Amino acid sequence: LYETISRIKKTTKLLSQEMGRKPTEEEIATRMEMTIEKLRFIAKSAQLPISLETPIGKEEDSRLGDFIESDGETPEDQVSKNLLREDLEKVLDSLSPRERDVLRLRYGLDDGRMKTLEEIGQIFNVTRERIRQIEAKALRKLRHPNRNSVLKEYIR
Amino acid sequence: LVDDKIHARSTGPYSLVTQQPLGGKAQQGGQRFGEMEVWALEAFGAAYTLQELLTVKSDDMQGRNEALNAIVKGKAIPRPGTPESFKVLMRELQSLGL
Amino acid sequence: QIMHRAEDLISAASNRYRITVQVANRAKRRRYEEFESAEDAMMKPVLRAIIEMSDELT
Amino acid sequence: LRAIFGEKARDVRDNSLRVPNGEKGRVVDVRLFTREQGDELPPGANMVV
Amino acid sequence: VETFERNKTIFFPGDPAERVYFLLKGAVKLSRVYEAGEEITVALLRENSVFGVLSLLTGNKSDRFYHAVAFTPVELLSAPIEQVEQALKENPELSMLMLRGLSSRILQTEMMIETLAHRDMGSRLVSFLLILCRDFGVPCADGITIDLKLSHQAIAEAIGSTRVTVTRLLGDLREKKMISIHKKKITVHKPVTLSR
Amino acid sequence: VETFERNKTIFFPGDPAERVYFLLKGAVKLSRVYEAGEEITVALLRENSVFGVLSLLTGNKSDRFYHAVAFTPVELLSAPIEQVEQALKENPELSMLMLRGLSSRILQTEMMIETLAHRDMGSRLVSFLLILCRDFGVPCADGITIDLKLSHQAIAEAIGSTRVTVTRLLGDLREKKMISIHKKKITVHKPVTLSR
């Protein structure tokens, strides 16, 4: 890679012969037998990182990198999701607790996400059926739009 | 013109490093800040504003958020977090040989 | 008035801060105590706090 | 949730451009172009908007 | 063009299915709903009819209360209240088609409606199979072929059988080789046969 | 104005019920037919909808195959293919009203279709009367009055209850007070308790 980045265009520089300076265009790829996309792939991967601590500009109040965050949570969806997640079970209040207490969180939810169909088969009512039915029962004990009809704005 | 010279916002992305929000005079521009005033905000003290006034709008994640909630959660926004940037400063120092 | 003659109570009651602080102490709770939207507390929690201080502060 | 609220959407996302608030301005041109002219493009990047 | 497969959620509680579903193709069904539930092919659309049905009730926010999904990669439009809008206000161009829509889906079910109302469900199965499995493919294994591969619990979901109309009814049909587990051809050798 | 009492015979095998079958009024039903038979209120018309339904199929000689009769007088302002004819070709005037007419018979029918194939019926029956008996009269005694005097085993002539629910459901809700025969006033005091 660190040689293609310094050869793909080098060649072209000379390969420019029979062409107009920067020879052809994606024929370059073909010239070196490659696919543009990989080319950009290589083109993109060149030069170097910027300082990220260099003056913003002619002025000061400026080393770069005074200068981003990726992620916190955008306070907005941390006060959201908790409400949502918590409510996903906090509004689980339109059913008898035979399912409300178990299938509540599918086979996981809040969990890494799992302890499953078997387990409940035993873990709760020595079932293997009753999982799917009472779960489906509750799986509908919330959908006809009136069941748990306090979080319809969810539209999610 | 007040248009390009307007400015005011309620939190948003903090930084990376300090992870503090950041005012480069943008739509989410730090209400900028002046310690010359934190050198005039103690003349009456009563921490609280200060206490907040750093914390939870600077370091504490769970503070800041704590807030968000408290109000929309009908809760008495608590008690500082503890700052952390502090801890950040402490970290490099500990490595520097602290 | 809404808030004006309150410049004396704090002014003449030993440690002023201190006052405040209690006053909050009222505040916090004397919102807190009732989260039933009692319109008494429809206004800000302090200002009551204050005043019923005030007019007990005779 | 996805499957629970009752629908299976997908996160193909879109941070498409939302002009800032108070932008009561009629739009008045555009210069714009993609791969084809050779996007004279900051590489790694597809098409000017 | 709007184009929907099976195992989905198409209508909901409350839907805005007004701006046209505009079904063009499937070989498939309106599952409906309401409260007691039964999202059953309480109508249908194959290829050759079109939605715009409760979508044309109080309209874009009626009490639109169904829910349907296919077993066919249903086919259905790329436009709003426009192609219909022609069809609605500016004439009867596709206005007669609008009425036809009901008479081509509602009334289509209307036939199955005076027939689904029978004692045994086998009838509804034979009727259903008389129109579908027979026609738009060739009556292969053991006659008027199931014209696809589905499941033996198909009846168990279509009508909502309880592992009862299954193996028992199947049994009968296994006895009269009007069945074909292989590629779910399951059928009488002749259309009239179980249609009596 | 076309105006039909209970009993008698209205559709036939083969009917020419075109030329405006304008059921303008009743509190009543389309009995239908075909071969297996069941001339059931496989639709309805009270006051406030109108025929013109399979009358507008292939039309004046379609395979028009029903048969309906009422439970009481049934008014029908009527015209030639004229009042409709306006309504059909010259615009959507009562083609705009016709789309509503298409839904008209269908609605209440498809709603009763939403009910109809529930398993056991006293239910859907309750739903049916919840529409009739409650609304367009007043409860009187026992609550949501049968809004008329009718048949004891309504089920007998309704779904066709031979000897099941024909008098059993009657007892099931008799002691329950949710039903009681007095001047045919026969109701829940509260449809809800039976609307479940």
Side-chain angles (χ1 to χ4, degrees), chain C residues 32-49:
Chain C
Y32 164 58
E33 74 281 18
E34 291 136 19
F35 282 159
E36 33 265 41
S37 194
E39 286 305 84
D40 289 345
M42 171 56 221
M43 294 300 293
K44 301 301 290 187
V46 51
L47 60 84
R48 81 190 61 259

mmCIF file with all atom_site columns, all heavy atoms in Angstrom, chain C residues 32-49:
data_model
loop_
_atom_site.group_PDB
_atom_site.id
_atom_site.type_symbol
_atom_site.label_atom_id
_atom_site.label_alt_id
_atom_site.label_comp_id
_atom_site.label_asym_id
_atom_site.label_entity_id
_atom_site.label_seq_id
_atom_site.pdbx_PDB_ins_code
_atom_site.Cartn_x
_atom_site.Cartn_y
_atom_site.Cartn_z
_atom_site.occupancy
_atom_site.B_iso_or_equiv
_atom_site.pdbx_formal_charge
_atom_site.auth_seq_id
_atom_site.auth_comp_id
_atom_site.auth_asym_id
_atom_site.auth_atom_id
_atom_site.pdbx_PDB_model_num
ATOM 1   N N   . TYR C 1 32 ? -41.219 19.591 47.622 1.00 0.00 ? 32 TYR C N   1
ATOM 2   C CA  . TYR C 1 32 ? -41.137 18.190 47.609 1.00 0.00 ? 32 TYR C CA  1
ATOM 3   C C   . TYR C 1 32 ? -42.361 17.618 48.233 1.00 0.00 ? 32 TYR C C   1
ATOM 4   O O   . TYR C 1 32 ? -43.046 16.828 47.607 1.00 0.00 ? 32 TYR C O   1
ATOM 5   C CB  . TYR C 1 32 ? -39.905 17.816 48.337 1.00 0.00 ? 32 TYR C CB  1
ATOM 6   C CG  . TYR C 1 32 ? -39.964 16.419 48.688 1.00 0.00 ? 32 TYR C CG  1
ATOM 7   C CD1 . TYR C 1 32 ? -40.106 15.443 47.724 1.00 0.00 ? 32 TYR C CD1 1
ATOM 8   C CD2 . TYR C 1 32 ? -39.789 16.035 49.981 1.00 0.00 ? 32 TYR C CD2 1
ATOM 9   C CE1 . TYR C 1 32 ? -40.128 14.135 48.061 1.00 0.00 ? 32 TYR C CE1 1
ATOM 10  C CE2 . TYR C 1 32 ? -39.798 14.723 50.324 1.00 0.00 ? 32 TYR C CE2 1
ATOM 11  C CZ  . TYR C 1 32 ? -39.965 13.791 49.362 1.00 0.00 ? 32 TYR C CZ  1
ATOM 12  O OH  . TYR C 1 32 ? -39.977 12.498 49.731 1.00 0.00 ? 32 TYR C OH  1
ATOM 13  N N   . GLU C 1 33 ? -42.725 18.129 49.391 1.00 0.00 ? 33 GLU C N   1
ATOM 14  C CA  . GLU C 1 33 ? -43.570 17.352 50.283 1.00 0.00 ? 33 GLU C CA  1
ATOM 15  C C   . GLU C 1 33 ? -44.797 16.986 49.516 1.00 0.00 ? 33 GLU C C   1
ATOM 16  O O   . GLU C 1 33 ? -45.275 15.857 49.560 1.00 0.00 ? 33 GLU C O   1
ATOM 17  C CB  . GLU C 1 33 ? -44.012 18.224 51.427 1.00 0.00 ? 33 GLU C CB  1
ATOM 18  C CG  . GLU C 1 33 ? -45.052 19.212 51.019 1.00 0.00 ? 33 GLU C CG  1
ATOM 19  C CD  . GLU C 1 33 ? -44.501 20.369 50.336 1.00 0.00 ? 33 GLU C CD  1
ATOM 20  O OE1 . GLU C 1 33 ? -43.374 20.205 49.905 1.00 0.00 ? 33 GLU C OE1 1
ATOM 21  O OE2 . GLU C 1 33 ? -45.156 21.414 50.198 1.00 0.00 ? 33 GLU C OE2 1
ATOM 22  N N   . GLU C 1 34 ? -45.238 17.899 48.640 1.00 0.00 ? 34 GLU C N   1
ATOM 23  C CA  . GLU C 1 34 ? -46.477 17.668 47.857 1.00 0.00 ? 34 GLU C CA  1
ATOM 24  C C   . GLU C 1 34 ? -46.146 17.648 46.365 1.00 0.00 ? 34 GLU C C   1
ATOM 25  O O   . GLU C 1 34 ? -45.782 18.712 45.830 1.00 0.00 ? 34 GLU C O   1
ATOM 26  C CB  . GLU C 1 34 ? -47.493 18.779 48.117 1.00 0.00 ? 34 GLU C CB  1
ATOM 27  C CG  . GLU C 1 34 ? -48.070 18.767 49.518 1.00 0.00 ? 34 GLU C CG  1
ATOM 28  C CD  . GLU C 1 34 ? -48.153 20.142 50.158 1.00 0.00 ? 34 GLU C CD  1
ATOM 29  O OE1 . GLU C 1 34 ? -48.104 21.142 49.414 1.00 0.00 ? 34 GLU C OE1 1
ATOM 30  O OE2 . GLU C 1 34 ? -48.258 20.209 51.399 1.00 0.00 ? 34 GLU C OE2 1
ATOM 31  N N   . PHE C 1 35 ? -46.267 16.485 45.725 1.00 0.00 ? 35 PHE C N   1
ATOM 32  C CA  . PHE C 1 35 ? -46.063 16.414 44.255 1.00 0.00 ? 35 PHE C CA  1
ATOM 33  C C   . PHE C 1 35 ? -47.435 16.205 43.608 1.00 0.00 ? 35 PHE C C   1
ATOM 34  O O   . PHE C 1 35 ? -47.516 15.507 42.579 1.00 0.00 ? 35 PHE C O   1
ATOM 35  C CB  . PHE C 1 35 ? -45.050 15.321 43.913 1.00 0.00 ? 35 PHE C CB  1
ATOM 36  C CG  . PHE C 1 35 ? -43.615 15.718 44.147 1.00 0.00 ? 35 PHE C CG  1
ATOM 37  C CD1 . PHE C 1 35 ? -42.628 14.760 44.317 1.00 0.00 ? 35 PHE C CD1 1
ATOM 38  C CD2 . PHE C 1 35 ? -43.250 17.054 44.200 1.00 0.00 ? 35 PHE C CD2 1
ATOM 39  C CE1 . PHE C 1 35 ? -41.310 15.130 44.531 1.00 0.00 ? 35 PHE C CE1 1
ATOM 40  C CE2 . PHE C 1 35 ? -41.932 17.422 44.413 1.00 0.00 ? 35 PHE C CE2 1
ATOM 41  C CZ  . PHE C 1 35 ? -40.963 16.459 44.578 1.00 0.00 ? 35 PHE C CZ  1
ATOM 42  N N   . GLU C 1 36 ? -48.476 16.795 44.202 1.00 0.00 ? 36 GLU C N   1
ATOM 43  C CA  . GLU C 1 36 ? -49.862 16.623 43.688 1.00 0.00 ? 36 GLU C CA  1
ATOM 44  C C   . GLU C 1 36 ? -50.290 17.892 42.947 1.00 0.00 ? 36 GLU C C   1
ATOM 45  O O   . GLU C 1 36 ? -51.511 18.095 42.797 1.00 0.00 ? 36 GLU C O   1
ATOM 46  C CB  . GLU C 1 36 ? -50.812 16.334 44.850 1.00 0.00 ? 36 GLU C CB  1
ATOM 47  C CG  . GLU C 1 36 ? -50.415 17.039 46.133 1.00 0.00 ? 36 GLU C CG  1
ATOM 48  C CD  . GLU C 1 36 ? -49.580 16.196 47.082 1.00 0.00 ? 36 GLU C CD  1
ATOM 49  O OE1 . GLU C 1 36 ? -48.684 15.476 46.600 1.00 0.00 ? 36 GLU C OE1 1
ATOM 50  O OE2 . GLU C 1 36 ? -49.828 16.262 48.302 1.00 0.00 ? 36 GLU C OE2 1
ATOM 51  N N   . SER C 1 37 ? -49.327 18.715 42.525 1.00 0.00 ? 37 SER C N   1
ATOM 52  C CA  . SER C 1 37 ? -49.638 19.946 41.749 1.00 0.00 ? 37 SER C CA  1
ATOM 53  C C   . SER C 1 37 ? -50.491 20.915 42.576 1.00 0.00 ? 37 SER C C   1
ATOM 54  O O   . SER C 1 37 ? -51.117 21.803 41.963 1.00 0.00 ? 37 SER C O   1
ATOM 55  C CB  . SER C 1 37 ? -50.308 19.607 40.441 1.00 0.00 ? 37 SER C CB  1
ATOM 56  O OG  . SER C 1 37 ? -50.305 20.727 39.570 1.00 0.00 ? 37 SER C OG  1
ATOM 57  N N   . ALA C 1 38 ? -50.523 20.755 43.903 1.00 0.00 ? 38 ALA C N   1
ATOM 58  C CA  . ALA C 1 38 ? -51.253 21.727 44.752 1.00 0.00 ? 38 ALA C CA  1
ATOM 59  C C   . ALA C 1 38 ? -50.974 23.129 44.206 1.00 0.00 ? 38 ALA C C   1
ATOM 60  O O   . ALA C 1 38 ? -49.795 23.522 44.192 1.00 0.00 ? 38 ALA C O   1
ATOM 61  C CB  . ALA C 1 38 ? -50.813 21.592 46.187 1.00 0.00 ? 38 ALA C CB  1
ATOM 62  N N   . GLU C 1 39 ? -52.007 23.850 43.760 1.00 0.00 ? 39 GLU C N   1
ATOM 63  C CA  . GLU C 1 39 ? -51.732 25.161 43.108 1.00 0.00 ? 39 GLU C CA  1
ATOM 64  C C   . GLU C 1 39 ? -51.058 26.110 44.092 1.00 0.00 ? 39 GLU C C   1
ATOM 65  O O   . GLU C 1 39 ? -50.463 27.099 43.637 1.00 0.00 ? 39 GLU C O   1
ATOM 66  C CB  . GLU C 1 39 ? -53.027 25.759 42.558 1.00 0.00 ? 39 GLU C CB  1
ATOM 67  C CG  . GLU C 1 39 ? -53.516 25.063 41.302 1.00 0.00 ? 39 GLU C CG  1
ATOM 68  C CD  . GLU C 1 39 ? -52.498 25.004 40.176 1.00 0.00 ? 39 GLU C CD  1
ATOM 69  O OE1 . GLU C 1 39 ? -51.658 24.082 40.183 1.00 0.00 ? 39 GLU C OE1 1
ATOM 70  O OE2 . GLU C 1 39 ? -52.551 25.879 39.289 1.00 0.00 ? 39 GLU C OE2 1
ATOM 71  N N   . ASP C 1 40 ? -51.204 25.866 45.394 1.00 0.00 ? 40 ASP C N   1
ATOM 72  C CA  . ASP C 1 40 ? -50.413 26.703 46.327 1.00 0.00 ? 40 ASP C CA  1
ATOM 73  C C   . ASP C 1 40 ? -49.011 26.699 45.722 1.00 0.00 ? 40 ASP C C   1
ATOM 74  O O   . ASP C 1 40 ? -48.460 27.794 45.532 1.00 0.00 ? 40 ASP C O   1
ATOM 75  C CB  . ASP C 1 40 ? -50.449 26.154 47.754 1.00 0.00 ? 40 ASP C CB  1
ATOM 76  C CG  . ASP C 1 40 ? -51.797 26.325 48.432 1.00 0.00 ? 40 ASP C CG  1
ATOM 77  O OD1 . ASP C 1 40 ? -52.615 27.113 47.916 1.00 0.00 ? 40 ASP C OD1 1
ATOM 78  O OD2 . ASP C 1 40 ? -52.012 25.682 49.478 1.00 0.00 ? 40 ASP C OD2 1
ATOM 79  N N   . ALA C 1 41 ? -48.521 25.503 45.362 1.00 0.00 ? 41 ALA C N   1
ATOM 80  C CA  . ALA C 1 41 ? -47.158 25.342 44.805 1.00 0.00 ? 41 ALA C CA  1
ATOM 81  C C   . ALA C 1 41 ? -47.169 25.509 43.284 1.00 0.00 ? 41 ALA C C   1
ATOM 82  O O   . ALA C 1 41 ? -46.146 25.177 42.655 1.00 0.00 ? 41 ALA C O   1
ATOM 83  C CB  . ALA C 1 41 ? -46.601 23.999 45.207 1.00 0.00 ? 41 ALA C CB  1
ATOM 84  N N   . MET C 1 42 ? -48.276 25.987 42.710 1.00 0.00 ? 42 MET C N   1
ATOM 85  C CA  . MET C 1 42 ? -48.280 26.269 41.251 1.00 0.00 ? 42 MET C CA  1
ATOM 86  C C   . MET C 1 42 ? -47.165 27.279 40.980 1.00 0.00 ? 42 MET C C   1
ATOM 87  O O   . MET C 1 42 ? -46.460 27.129 39.963 1.00 0.00 ? 42 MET C O   1
ATOM 88  C CB  . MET C 1 42 ? -49.618 26.853 40.792 1.00 0.00 ? 42 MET C CB  1
ATOM 89  C CG  . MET C 1 42 ? -49.602 27.354 39.362 1.00 0.00 ? 42 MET C CG  1
ATOM 90  S SD  . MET C 1 42 ? -49.096 26.072 38.187 1.00 0.00 ? 42 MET C SD  1
ATOM 91  C CE  . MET C 1 42 ? -48.032 27.022 37.101 1.00 0.00 ? 42 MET C CE  1
ATOM 92  N N   . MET C 1 43 ? -46.998 28.255 41.880 1.00 0.00 ? 43 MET C N   1
ATOM 93  C CA  . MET C 1 43 ? -45.903 29.249 41.732 1.00 0.00 ? 43 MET C CA  1
ATOM 94  C C   . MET C 1 43 ? -44.568 28.583 42.081 1.00 0.00 ? 43 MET C C   1
ATOM 95  O O   . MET C 1 43 ? -44.561 27.364 42.332 1.00 0.00 ? 43 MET C O   1
ATOM 96  C CB  . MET C 1 43 ? -46.121 30.459 42.645 1.00 0.00 ? 43 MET C CB  1
ATOM 97  C CG  . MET C 1 43 ? -47.339 31.273 42.260 1.00 0.00 ? 43 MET C CG  1
ATOM 98  S SD  . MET C 1 43 ? -47.215 31.922 40.572 1.00 0.00 ? 43 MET C SD  1
ATOM 99  C CE  . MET C 1 43 ? -45.861 33.081 40.753 1.00 0.00 ? 43 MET C CE  1
ATOM 100 N N   . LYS C 1 44 ? -43.483 29.357 42.107 1.00 0.00 ? 44 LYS C N   1
ATOM 101 C CA  . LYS C 1 44 ? -42.142 28.755 42.340 1.00 0.00 ? 44 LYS C CA  1
ATOM 102 C C   . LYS C 1 44 ? -42.030 28.292 43.796 1.00 0.00 ? 44 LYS C C   1
ATOM 103 O O   . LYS C 1 44 ? -42.666 28.912 44.670 1.00 0.00 ? 44 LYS C O   1
ATOM 104 C CB  . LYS C 1 44 ? -41.046 29.743 41.926 1.00 0.00 ? 44 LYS C CB  1
ATOM 105 C CG  . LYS C 1 44 ? -41.123 30.161 40.465 1.00 0.00 ? 44 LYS C CG  1
ATOM 106 C CD  . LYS C 1 44 ? -41.016 28.973 39.528 1.00 0.00 ? 44 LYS C CD  1
ATOM 107 C CE  . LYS C 1 44 ? -39.637 28.344 39.497 1.00 0.00 ? 44 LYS C CE  1
ATOM 108 N NZ  . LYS C 1 44 ? -39.532 27.300 38.452 1.00 0.00 ? 44 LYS C NZ  1
ATOM 109 N N   . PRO C 1 45 ? -41.263 27.221 44.087 1.00 0.00 ? 45 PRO C N   1
ATOM 110 C CA  . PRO C 1 45 ? -41.178 26.687 45.445 1.00 0.00 ? 45 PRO C CA  1
ATOM 111 C C   . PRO C 1 45 ? -40.511 27.678 46.403 1.00 0.00 ? 45 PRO C C   1
ATOM 112 O O   . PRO C 1 45 ? -40.835 27.643 47.575 1.00 0.00 ? 45 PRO C O   1
ATOM 113 C CB  . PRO C 1 45 ? -40.296 25.440 45.291 1.00 0.00 ? 45 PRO C CB  1
ATOM 114 C CG  . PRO C 1 45 ? -39.490 25.710 44.040 1.00 0.00 ? 45 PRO C CG  1
ATOM 115 C CD  . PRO C 1 45 ? -40.429 26.483 43.138 1.00 0.00 ? 45 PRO C CD  1
ATOM 116 N N   . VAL C 1 46 ? -39.612 28.531 45.902 1.00 0.00 ? 46 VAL C N   1
ATOM 117 C CA  . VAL C 1 46 ? -38.977 29.397 46.796 1.00 0.00 ? 46 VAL C CA  1
ATOM 118 C C   . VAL C 1 46 ? -39.922 30.388 47.309 1.00 0.00 ? 46 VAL C C   1
ATOM 119 O O   . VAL C 1 46 ? -40.169 30.507 48.487 1.00 0.00 ? 46 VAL C O   1
ATOM 120 C CB  . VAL C 1 46 ? -37.912 30.059 45.994 1.00 0.00 ? 46 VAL C CB  1
ATOM 121 C CG1 . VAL C 1 46 ? -38.588 30.554 44.823 1.00 0.00 ? 46 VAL C CG1 1
ATOM 122 C CG2 . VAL C 1 46 ? -37.672 31.182 46.714 1.00 0.00 ? 46 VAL C CG2 1
ATOM 123 N N   . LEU C 1 47 ? -40.574 30.992 46.412 1.00 0.00 ? 47 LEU C N   1
ATOM 124 C CA  . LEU C 1 47 ? -41.076 32.248 46.762 1.00 0.00 ? 47 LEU C CA  1
ATOM 125 C C   . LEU C 1 47 ? -42.024 32.042 47.860 1.00 0.00 ? 47 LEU C C   1
ATOM 126 O O   . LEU C 1 47 ? -42.041 32.783 48.833 1.00 0.00 ? 47 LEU C O   1
ATOM 127 C CB  . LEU C 1 47 ? -41.667 32.832 45.531 1.00 0.00 ? 47 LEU C CB  1
ATOM 128 C CG  . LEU C 1 47 ? -42.775 31.951 45.004 1.00 0.00 ? 47 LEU C CG  1
ATOM 129 C CD1 . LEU C 1 47 ? -44.133 32.144 45.638 1.00 0.00 ? 47 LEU C CD1 1
ATOM 130 C CD2 . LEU C 1 47 ? -42.806 32.174 43.516 1.00 0.00 ? 47 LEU C CD2 1
ATOM 131 N N   . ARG C 1 48 ? -42.736 30.953 47.786 1.00 0.00 ? 48 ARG C N   1
ATOM 132 C CA  . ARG C 1 48 ? -43.494 30.684 48.942 1.00 0.00 ? 48 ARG C CA  1
ATOM 133 C C   . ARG C 1 48 ? -42.505 30.596 50.018 1.00 0.00 ? 48 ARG C C   1
ATOM 134 O O   . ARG C 1 48 ? -42.479 31.460 50.893 1.00 0.00 ? 48 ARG C O   1
ATOM 135 C CB  . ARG C 1 48 ? -44.303 29.424 48.802 1.00 0.00 ? 48 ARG C CB  1
ATOM 136 C CG  . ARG C 1 48 ? -43.594 28.142 49.048 1.00 0.00 ? 48 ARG C CG  1
ATOM 137 C CD  . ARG C 1 48 ? -44.482 27.014 48.631 1.00 0.00 ? 48 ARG C CD  1
ATOM 138 N NE  . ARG C 1 48 ? -44.760 27.157 47.210 1.00 0.00 ? 48 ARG C NE  1
ATOM 139 C CZ  . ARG C 1 48 ? -45.881 27.660 46.709 1.00 0.00 ? 48 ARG C CZ  1
ATOM 140 N NH1 . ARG C 1 48 ? -46.893 28.002 47.483 1.00 0.00 ? 48 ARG C NH1 1
ATOM 141 N NH2 . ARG C 1 48 ? -45.976 27.851 45.400 1.00 0.00 ? 48 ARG C NH2 1
ATOM 142 N N   . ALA C 1 49 ? -41.492 29.803 49.766 1.00 0.00 ? 49 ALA C N   1
ATOM 143 C CA  . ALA C 1 49 ? -40.732 29.437 50.910 1.00 0.00 ? 49 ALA C CA  1
ATOM 144 C C   . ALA C 1 49 ? -40.536 30.650 51.726 1.00 0.00 ? 49 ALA C C   1
ATOM 145 O O   . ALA C 1 49 ? -40.856 30.713 52.912 1.00 0.00 ? 49 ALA C O   1
ATOM 146 C CB  . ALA C 1 49 ? -39.423 28.870 50.472 1.00 0.00 ? 49 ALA C CB  1
#
